[PDB]
Design a protein around this ligand. Structure first.
Ligand SMILES: Nc1ncnc2c1ncn2[C@@H]1O[C@H](COP(=O)(O)OP(=O)(O)OP(=O)(O)O)[C@@H](O)[C@H]1O
Ligand SMILES: Nc1ncnc2c1ncn2[C@@H]1O[C@H](COP(=O)(O)OP(=O)(O)OP(=O)(O)O)[C@@H](O)[C@H]1O
Ligand SMILES: Nc1ncnc2c1ncn2[C@@H]1O[C@H](COP(=O)(O)OP(=O)(O)O)[C@@H](O)[C@H]1O
Ligand SMILES: [K+]
Ligand SMILES: [Mg+2]
Ligand SMILES: [Mg+2]
Ligand SMILES: [Mg+2]
Ligand SMILES: [Zn+2]
Lengths: 617, 616, 190
DNA sequence: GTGATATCTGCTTTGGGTGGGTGGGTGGGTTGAGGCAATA
DNA sequence: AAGCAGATATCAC
């Protein structure tokens, strides 16, 4: 059989690269990575193109110019490099991915001259299709002689063997496909679009079809901005091609036997071997392991700091002057309580909701923005919404299908995170009624035409509101200043007010702070802890589930009795559970395993100042 | 040794005669000898139950097979078709040994596997699961009728028998009389809405049900599906994709509704023994009342009413021309933060068929039934709403007072006549809706005013209020002793249910209660043979006199029929086949205590004095 | 196709040295419009824009409300012609070009005018959804979409030049600005 | 006498409603009237 | 009527 010299040389050199390339530490970089390919779910190896370029520049150039031609041989080299380990079945297939290609091309630079070369592009995913199994090499039985033919390559069309393997056999038409000994690969089709940055001025966006295979399937989601590394190929019009096993199914080139009197056109698709984001079962021990040693000692030092509450408060909100209590409340919301389930299967809410009622231009939006920028999972939205979904689900009809579907709202998109809601007093009646269940039961229930669903809304809500008159009236109570109903107010753990103090000194402090922030953007900010440090510390601290002790039990019971005796707003069991949640969050803040009385004292201070502020002018 | 493979695949190994015979013998021995913890022959009872009901399927728990036959358990996921065929043959041999005449009822026994440990999501299925036994879960979105499929074909002289596979037309006209058929059903399974990330399109799979597996599930159901992941060449898929992609399907082996549900048939003899022994207890009523939402500090009237609603009354149709419902509807109404929503959530968790909906999230047609438009088939079709889907179940409605009035008026027919009548778009029909409605509402202004009556506190009118058999008023009063007790209970509840870990009677475990309820609703039909007509009639007249004087709530004939339902439900709780005097007395007390609670605070003392003789 | 140099930079710097460059540019901005000096100065400052701190909106938003028959549309047209990355659009829903983002993902004029100026002519004729979209763009400089399985945030760092008419046939002196044009005060405060 | 290679024969096509709505609208067909949810 | 799949007789070497 004729032998492709270039591809074989590439295979040999790639095997050498895999075996010999050395990391900084002196170990073989890719031996330890290939050691992971013994698992059944893992079949792809990610190789940095810069490492390969350092090892051998001629090999890298040959791969770049003949990627489509030589890729199967690189996969064969990987198979050889993995063959030693006993756990791999002989039937397993392995694939190579290439990570860091120095140069990038635009979607409108994908011309015919790029067919078969290694390329990297960026795009916004518009649509993802279901996963399929795709045949790569078929095993067939010959019906004339019962000989078994293996490794029949497929070319965009279901192909059967051309001639029987047996020299005596002359069969050309009768074969049987055997699925159990054939080879399949995972297959996914995605449709991507030009990013808004790349879209030329006054031009309709240009779309592209990308094919993901093996591990790359289900790794990109619609709306994501992703970098794809792979190759540009042509895909013929399969509908025109006729084969012994497959009839044709209802200008281009003419003259192929499989074409009859028909024409064959082509279209360009991108065959991606690697997908990444364009801009890039937990437990305390695993969280620790994910961190480096420096980060772990920083987290421990943070846990040991005796001024942690104040340092965290100042670090999180450096641009805001004053309002220390509001910062403390928002921090406690960020740490959260311990969600629990009862013996009968019902849930006890562990999340904390906070409300901030403010005068105009009092920086409540600043609080919401700080939390939104800090939190990994956080959604910022307005009470008055642009879409029909709003803060909860909506039911909309697909015109073509006539089917009814759920459109998700803000509280659904923020599930397991934080929802910052601005202008919380402008909600509509549908959202107003649904938010009862959303805030307490943490679910949204729908029984409408074509839809019957319970949707998860396990969220912590941080809300910002305006007073009814547009200016806060100290003579009245907080309940008298806002338009929130009493049942909604009972669902909030903490309430805060921000009043415009018509004071010269406060005005002078705020003006100096703003002007200093603008004059020296970098120099103005001074955080005891960096935001990344706080993110790691919060990730570590959320793994603790402090237990309520007996003394804390007695203190909580006494405080609840006092609150009820003191008192359409009223002290309900919700205040008791809010106090429990706040105590749990206070204990969590110090990575502690038991809720001590001190945490209860602090939580009761905050909650008592919230309740009194709700009641009296 | 069976485990040792001489350079063959598992399929090849089990295909040859030696290992095939060994597997057959091992499985037969497993069926004959397997015993449970107590030592009872499991499959002797299972086969007896199968044959008494004239069924054709034997269910095998994977864990038992793995414990007793580890090699067979290992083989089963890798070569499912062959192993299942061998199991079917061995099962038929054993069954015919136990019941030698059973061959007249059926000639094939299907072995079905449950509790398969290899659970996968619909999104997670890859090419490495092809031709394996897999377990997945989802929502049934589409379901065909039961269709006849060729099994053993004969052609016209008449050609010899020919077998039919799921993937290609057989190659020899068909003789209808001499051909053999099988039941065929195709279902579409979808990701459950609570498991798909918000704003994302769900994934779906197709499944094929055969023989006695058909009609195992209905659209809208939550199902766990165990079957074979199968792929077959499809030309139009290839055309569509431009690549040689194969179509996939699940060849179903076992279908279960697995959201904590046990059927009456699945109850064993020991379970029935335990249930009967429990019913013998003198305090069983109190123990069942205490089992309703044990993590709520006492609201003893609500728990009693909810237990009665769960067990239910007895439908009657004296001469085929006068239908009376057996269901008991409940309305909770009271102050905020009193655990009304928690009660509704508990009822949803404990019931076999329950649908939970809230306030403005429910529409009129979504509750009862809706007319679906189509672009290509018949233009208009009828589809089931909440009440139809919850037929013989429970519909829970939270924020009942916040509903749109037009949407709230759509349940009137279902609450009394237990049917939904639709006359729309060429469709004139009636559907069955026999469901218990449990609703929770807040009073006008968000606080119940003791100086007023129940009718003054709520915005609901007489027609809807009369449809509720039991009315419960939840009041949040400030009392230091009660507040301390509630606080000490709630904090203890938060201590007990840390994830690391009034009646005076011990409640039943929730699993025990679920078995008890299913047995009583299925195997007990209490009969109302005798009743003190004069006492009930005199009581009804007194109640109607007082209701007209005060106007606290309307009293109608529906109040007489509710008492009879409550007496039947009380008898059902005791597993009694005939209602007795103590059931009627309990029903009277429940109705009178409810009525007194609807009065103003000043009048309450007089009302207890008026009806003291009954309340004694 | 049928529709800097060192000398050009030297000319620009020579202009920048002149004592009255502000008024010269303001006069050049819109020669046809008559006697609206302060409006022209504000529009010039909007064209230049503030400093991108990269920590702070640097964008300047201007609303021209007034009686019918003035030269508001002409000013908006002149600014639209001047700016390189600008969009001219209308608040009316029936409008051919929309403000909102809506398989092909179609971003609206606000996203298209990112790092540019969006001219909105019938500001008072916006529906509630468009008002919410505009508030989000002006407050957060982003546009969130969750539709047809697509979830994303699109950058919209755009300066709004809006034109508004009163609800009545003429401006009512007895009425303030808020009650003369039916728009929320929360939107006007941006 | 075997390997092409030229001739001959039978199948089914078309989009279509006597080929079904118990095939399916991800296999593809204007116009109007009729239920929904969100809407005002 | 137009064209591909299959069957088969026929020249040539
Ligand atoms: N206490 C404060 N400390 C620092 N900056 C402040 C303070 N109060 C207001 N500011 C400044 O005010 C601006 C914040 O306005 P923001 O949009 O957050 O107000 P708001 O409370 O949401 O009001 P509104 O919604 O009515 O516009 C920023 O310039 C912020 O620097
Ligand atoms: N100050 C002005 N300078 C120049 N032309 C003016 C001025 N005021 C009015 N005009 C004339 O009026 C007409 C401008 O109408 P235009 O379409 O610009 O109005 P508009 O302010 O957008 O109002 P509307 O949409 O309510 O009619 C032109 O004839 C313009 O010459
Ligand atoms: N009597 C009680 N015993 C135990 N928990 C209670 C009680 N009353 C209220 N709660 C708790 O208060 C919380 C709020 O109750 P909720 O279900 O909102 O009642 P409602 O819907 O009537 O306002 C719940 O999480 C519940 O566990
Ligand atoms: K059709
Ligand atoms: Mg704001
Ligand atoms: Mg509730
Ligand atoms: Mg104009
Ligand atoms: Zn052969």
């Amino acid at each position: 059989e004729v032998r492709d010299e270039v591809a074989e040389k590439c295979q040999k050199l790639f095997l050498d690269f895999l075996e010999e390339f050395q990391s900084s530490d002196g170990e073989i970089k890719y031996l330890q990575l290939a050691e992971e390919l013994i698992r059944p779910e893992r079949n792809t190896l990610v190789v940095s193109f810069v490492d390969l370029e350092q090892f051998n520049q001629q090999l890298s150039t040959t791969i770049q110019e003949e990627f489509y031609r030589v890729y199967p041989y690189l996969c064969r080299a990987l198979k050889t490099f993995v063959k030693d380990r006993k756990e791999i079945p002989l039937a397993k297939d392995f694939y190579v991915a290439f990570q860091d290609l120095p140069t990038r091309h635009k979607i409108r630079e994908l011309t015919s001259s790029r067919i078969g070369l290694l390329t990297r592009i960026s795009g916004q995913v518009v649509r993802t299709h279901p996963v399929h199994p795709e045949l790569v090499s078929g095993t067939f039985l010959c019906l004339d002689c019962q000989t078994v033919i293996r490794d029949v390559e497929q070319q965009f069309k279901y192909t059967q063997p051309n001639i029987c393997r047996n020299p005596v056999c002359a069969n050309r038409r009768r074969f049987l496909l055997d699925t159990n000994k054939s080879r399949f690969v995972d297959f996914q089709k995605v449709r991507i679009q030009e990013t808004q940055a790349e879209l030329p001025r006054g031009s309709i966006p240009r779309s592209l079809e990308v094919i993901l295979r093996a591990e790359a399937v289900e790794s990109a989601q619609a709306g994501d901005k992703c970098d794809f590394t792979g190759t540009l190929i042509v895909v013929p019009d399969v509908s025109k091609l006729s084969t012994p096993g497959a009839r044709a199914e209802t200008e281009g080139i003419r003259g192929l036997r499989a074409l009859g009197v028909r024409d064959l056109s082509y279209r360009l698709v991108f065959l991606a071997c690697c997908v990444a984001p364009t801009n890039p079962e937990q437990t305390a021990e695993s969280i620790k392991n994910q961190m480096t040693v420096k980060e772990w000692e920083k987290v421990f030092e943070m846990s040991q700091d005796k001024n942690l509450y104040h340092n965290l408060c100042t670090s999180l909100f450096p641009t805001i002057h004053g309002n220390d209590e509001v910062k403390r409340g928002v921090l406690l919301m960020l740490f959260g309580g311990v969600p629990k389930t009862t013996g009968e299967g019902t849930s006890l809410r562990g999340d904390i909701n906070v409300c901030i009622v403010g005068d105009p231009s009092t920086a409540k939006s600043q609080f919401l923005k700080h939390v939104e920028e800090f939190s990994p999972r956080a959604v910022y939205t307005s009470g008055k919404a642009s879409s029909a979904a709003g803060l909860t689900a909506a039911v909309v009809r697909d015109e073509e299908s006539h089917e009814f579907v759920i459109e998700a709202g803000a509280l659904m998109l923020a599930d397991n995170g934080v929802c910052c809601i601005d202008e919380f007093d402008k909600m509509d009646v549908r959202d107003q009624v649904a938010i009862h269940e959303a805030m307490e039961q943490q679910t949204i229930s729908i029984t409408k035409a074509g839809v019957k669903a319970t949707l998860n809304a396990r969220t912590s809500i941080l809300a910002a509101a305006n007073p009814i008159s547009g200016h806060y009236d100290r003579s009245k109570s907080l309940k008298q200043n806002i338009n929130l109903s009493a049942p909604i107010m009972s669902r909030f753990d903490l309430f805060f007010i921000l009043v415009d103090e018509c004071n010269e000194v406060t005005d002078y402090a705020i003006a100096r702070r703003i002007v200093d922030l603008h004059s020296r953007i970098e120099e103005s900010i001074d955080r005891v802890y960096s935001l990344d440090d706080i993110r790691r510390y919060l990730l570590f601290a959320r793994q603790f589930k402090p237990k309520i002790s007996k003394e804390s039990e007695d203190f909580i019971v006494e405080q609840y009795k006092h609150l009820r005796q003191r008192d359409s707003w009223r002290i309900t069991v919700r205040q008791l559970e809010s106090m429990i949640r706040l105590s749990e969050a206070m204990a969590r803040m110090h990575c502690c395993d038991e809720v001590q009385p001190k945490h209860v004292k602090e939580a009761f201070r905050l909650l008592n100042k919230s309740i009194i502020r709700v009641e009296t002018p | 040794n069976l485990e040792d493979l001489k350079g063959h695949s598992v399929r090849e190994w089990v295909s040859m005669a030696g290992p095939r015979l060994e597997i057959h013998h091992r499985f037969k021995n497993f069926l004959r000898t397997h015993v449970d913890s107590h030592g009872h022959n499991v499959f002797k009872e299972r086969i007896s139950d199968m044959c008494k009901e004239n069924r054709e399927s034997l269910v095998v728990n994977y864990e038992d097979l793995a414990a007793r036959e580890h090699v067979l358990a290992y083989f089963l996921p890798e070569a499912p078709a062959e192993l299942l065929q061998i199991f079917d043959e061995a099962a038929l041999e054993v069954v015919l040994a136990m019941y030698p005449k059973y061959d007249r009822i059926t000639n094939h026994i299907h072995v079905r596997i449950s509790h398969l440990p290899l659970v996968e999501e619909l999104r997670s299925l890859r090419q490495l699961h092809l031709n394996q036994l897999i377990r997945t879960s989802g929502v049934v979105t589409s379901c065909t009728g039961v269709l006849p499929q060729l099994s053993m074909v004969k052609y016209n002289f008449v050609l010899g028998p020919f077998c039919q596979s799921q993937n290609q037309e057989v190659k020899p006209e068909v003789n209808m009389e001499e051909t053999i058929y099988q039941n065929y059903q195709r279902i579409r399974i979808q990701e459950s809405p609570g498991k798909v990330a918000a704003g994302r399109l769900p994934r779906s799979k197709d499944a094929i049900l055969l023989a006695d597996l058909v009609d195992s599930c209905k659209p809208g159901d939550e199902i766990e599906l165990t079957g074979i992941y199968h792929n077959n060449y499809d030309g139009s898929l290839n055309t569509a994709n431009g690549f040689p992609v194969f179509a996939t399907v699940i060849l179903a082996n076992h279908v279960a509704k697995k959201d904590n549900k046990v059927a009456v048939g699945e109850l064993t003899d020991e379970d029935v023994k335990m249930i009967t022994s429990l019913s013998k207890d003198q305090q069983i009523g109190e123990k069942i009342f205490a089992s309703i939402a044990p993590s709520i500090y006492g609201h003893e009237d609500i728990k009693r009413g909810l237990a009665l609603a769960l067990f239910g009354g007895e439908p009657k149709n004296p001469g085929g021309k006068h239908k009376v419902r057996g269901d008991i509807n409940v309305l909770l109404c009271g102050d905020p933060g009193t655990a009304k929503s928690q009660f509704l959530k508990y009822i949803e968790k404990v019931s076999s068929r329950a649908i939970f909906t809230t306030g403005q999230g429910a529409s009129a047609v979504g509750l009862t039934a809706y007319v679906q438009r189509h672009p290509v088939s018949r233009e208009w079709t009828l589809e089931a709403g909440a009440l139809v889907l919850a037929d013989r179940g429970v519909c829970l409605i939270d924020e009942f007072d916040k509903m749109n009035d037009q949407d709230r008026t759509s349940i009137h027919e279902a609450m009394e006549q237990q049917s939904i009548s639709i006359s729309k778009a060429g469709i004139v029909t009636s559907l069955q809706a026999r469901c218990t409605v449990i609703a929770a509402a807040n009073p006008i202004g968000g606080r119940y005013d003791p100086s007023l009556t129940f009718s003054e506190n709520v915005d609901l009118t007489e027609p809807i209020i009369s449809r509720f058999d039991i009315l419960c008023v939840v009041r949040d009063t400030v009392d230091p002793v009660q507040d301390e007790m509630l606080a000490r209970f709630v904090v203890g509840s938060h201590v007990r249910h840390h994830p690391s870990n009034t009646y005076g009677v011990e409640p039943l475990p929730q699993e025990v209660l679920k078995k008890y309820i299913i047995y009583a609703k299925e195997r007990v039909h209490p009969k109302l043979n005798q009743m003190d007509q004069d006492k009930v009639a005199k009581m009804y007249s007194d109640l109607r006199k007082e209701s007209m004087a005060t106007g606290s709530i309307p009293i109608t004939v529906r109040h007489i029929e509710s008492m009879i339902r409550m007496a039947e439900a009380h008898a059902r709780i005791h597993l009694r086949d005939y209602v007795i005097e103590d059931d009627v007395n309990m029903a009277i007390r429940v109705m009178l205590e409810s009525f007194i609670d609807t009065q103003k605070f000043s009048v309450m003392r007089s009302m207890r004095k008026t009806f003291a003789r009954y309340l004694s | 196709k049928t529709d800097f140099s060192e000398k050009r930079v030297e000319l620009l710097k020579e202009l920048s040295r002149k004592p009255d460059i502000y008024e010269r540019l303001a006069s050049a901005l819109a020669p046809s419009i008559y006697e609206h000096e302060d409006i022209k100065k504000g529009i010039l400052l909007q064209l230049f824009g503030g400093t991108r701190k990269d920590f702070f909106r640097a964008e300047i938003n201007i609303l021209l409300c007034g009686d019918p028959g003035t030269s508001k549309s002409q000013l908006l047209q002149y600014v639209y012609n001047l700016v390189p990355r600008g969009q001219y659009t209308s608040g009316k829903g029936s409008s051919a070009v929309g403000l909102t983002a809506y398989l092909v993902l179609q971003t609206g004029a606000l996203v298209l005018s990112d790092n540019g100026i969006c001219c909105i002519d019938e500001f008072d004729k916006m529906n509630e959804s468009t008002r919410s979209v505009l508030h989000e763009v002006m407050e957060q400089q982003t546009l969130s979409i969750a539709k047809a399985g697509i979830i994303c945030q699109l950058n919209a760092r755009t300066s709004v030049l809006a034109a508004a008419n009163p609800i009545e046939s003429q401006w009512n002196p007895k009425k303030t600005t808020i009650e003369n044009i039916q728009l929320p005060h929360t939107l006007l405060s941006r």
